[PDB]
Scaffold this active site. Structure first.
Site, PDB file in Angstrom:
ATOM      1  N   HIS A  46      -4.354  -3.027   7.291  1.00 48.79           N
ATOM      2  CA  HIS A  46      -5.380  -3.653   6.321  1.00 48.79           C
ATOM      3  C   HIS A  46      -5.902  -2.182   5.551  1.00 48.79           C
ATOM      4  CE1 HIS A  46      -8.919  -4.660   4.574  1.00 48.79           C
ATOM      5  NE2 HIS A  46      -9.765  -4.058   5.349  1.00 48.79           N
ATOM      6  N   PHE A  47      -5.848  -2.119   4.300  1.00 41.22           N
ATOM      7  CA  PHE A  47      -6.497  -0.886   3.578  1.00 41.22           C
ATOM      8  C   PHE A  47      -8.058  -1.501   3.181  1.00 41.22           C
ATOM      9  CE2 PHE A  47      -5.642   3.153   1.804  1.00 41.22           C
ATOM     10  CZ  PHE A  47      -7.013   3.205   0.830  1.00 41.22           C
ATOM     11  N   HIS A  66       0.967  -1.182   0.120  1.00 42.50           N
ATOM     12  CA  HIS A  66       0.044  -0.033  -0.027  1.00 42.50           C
ATOM     13  C   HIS A  66       0.776   1.197  -0.024  1.00 42.50           C
ATOM     14  CE1 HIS A  66      -3.569  -2.591   0.443  1.00 42.50           C
ATOM     15  NE2 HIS A  66      -3.040  -3.004   1.865  1.00 42.50           N
ATOM     16  N   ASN A 119      -6.458  -3.101  -5.366  1.00 45.37           N
ATOM     17  CA  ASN A 119      -5.501  -2.589  -4.493  1.00 45.37           C
ATOM     18  C   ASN A 119      -5.096  -1.144  -4.822  1.00 45.37           C
ATOM     19  OD1 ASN A 119      -3.498  -3.848  -2.388  1.00 45.37           O
ATOM     20  ND2 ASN A 119      -2.097  -2.613  -3.713  1.00 45.37           N
TER      21      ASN A 119
END
Length: 122
Positions: A117-118, A12, A44
């Site tokens: 976490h995204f 990320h 993503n």
């Protein structure tokens, strides 16, 4: 092997540029960050801000995660992001991506004060 914090940075964080430079950004980064090894990851997001600024999001606005968890956190300020999303022509191991530039608030799940976490952008 990998810590969840380090997996966040790898998947990320691109602090090397303030925006996706061109349309083949995703094709190149999705590969070079190991998100196409075993299969093409469908979607993503890349964040174009300091590690320090993204880590800080853990102590900004507490929000619910898409799954309903309550350890998600939304940035006070919009950030420079690139959304990556598989094209219709994509098939493992030749994974192809649409690049889309955006300035949006990032929502991240944190653990022990760190982004792990995204989850979403608004």
């Amino acid at each position: 092997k990998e810590t969840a914090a380090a997996k966040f940075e790898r998947q990320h964080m691109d602090s090397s540029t303030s925006a996706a430079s061109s349309s083949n950004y995703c094709n190149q980064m999705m590969k070079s960050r190991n998100l196409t090894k075993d299969r093409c990851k469908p979607v993503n997001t890349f964040v174009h801000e300091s590690l320090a600024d993204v880590q800080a999001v853990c102590s900004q606005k507490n929000v619910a995660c898409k799954n309903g968890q309550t350890n998600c956190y939304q940035s006070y300020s919009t950030m420079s992001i690139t959304d990556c999303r598989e094209t219709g022509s994509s098939k493992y191991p030749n994974c192809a991506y649409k690049t889309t530039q955006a300035n949006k608030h990032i929502i991240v799940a944190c653990e022990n004060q760190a982004p792990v976490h995204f989850d979403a952008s608004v």
